[PDB]
């Protein structure tokens, strides 16, 4: 290769790199936030559970099997919280229940996407059992917030 031509070519990648980093960037903060909604959905079982005994949360329980409220992954940790509705009771209202997941709280601790780190996922939890997303205790970009909580 010559001056130029190499001059040339690092010029074009340089450029084409102005606009591929930030959605590579996007995309592994994507791509780790969807933990949040894989550990929110493991709690779905402790939540139905607790609710047994008119709580969302519940504590952990040595004779009875029965788990607390934290589950803790590598990109963040998610918690069961909220005060359980009684009165709601069509599949469409929300129960009470929430999970609270929070970036940069897992395993890998603040190493990991900075796009995320110290936000907040909340999702509201509706009589069926589904899932959407809480928006104003979400800190978490709407970018990064996994389709299937959106509907």
């Known amino acids: 290769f010559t001056l130029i031509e190499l001059m040339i070519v690092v010029a074009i ?6 606009f591929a980093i930030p959605a590579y960037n996007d995309y592994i903060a994507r791509s780790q936030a969807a933990e949040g ?3 929110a959905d493991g709690l779905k079982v402790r939540i139905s559970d607790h609710l047994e005994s008119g709580e969302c949360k519940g504590d952990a329980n040595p004779a009875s099997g029965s788990l607390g409220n934290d589950d803790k992954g ?3 940790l998610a918690t069961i919280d909220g005060d359980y509705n009684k009165d709601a009771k069509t599949a469409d209202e929300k129960n009470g229940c929430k999970v609270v997941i929070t970036y940069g709280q897992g395993t890998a601790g603040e190493k990991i996407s900075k796009l995320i780190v110290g936000k907040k996922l909340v999702l509201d939890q509706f009589v069926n059992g589904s899932y959407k997303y809480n928006e104003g205790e979400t800190d978490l970009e709407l970018k990064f917030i996994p389709n299937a909580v959106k509907n």
């Open 37 to 39: 909604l894989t550990l």
């Open 74 to 76: 590598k990109y963040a």
């Open 13 to 18: 990648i340089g450029i084409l790199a102005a």
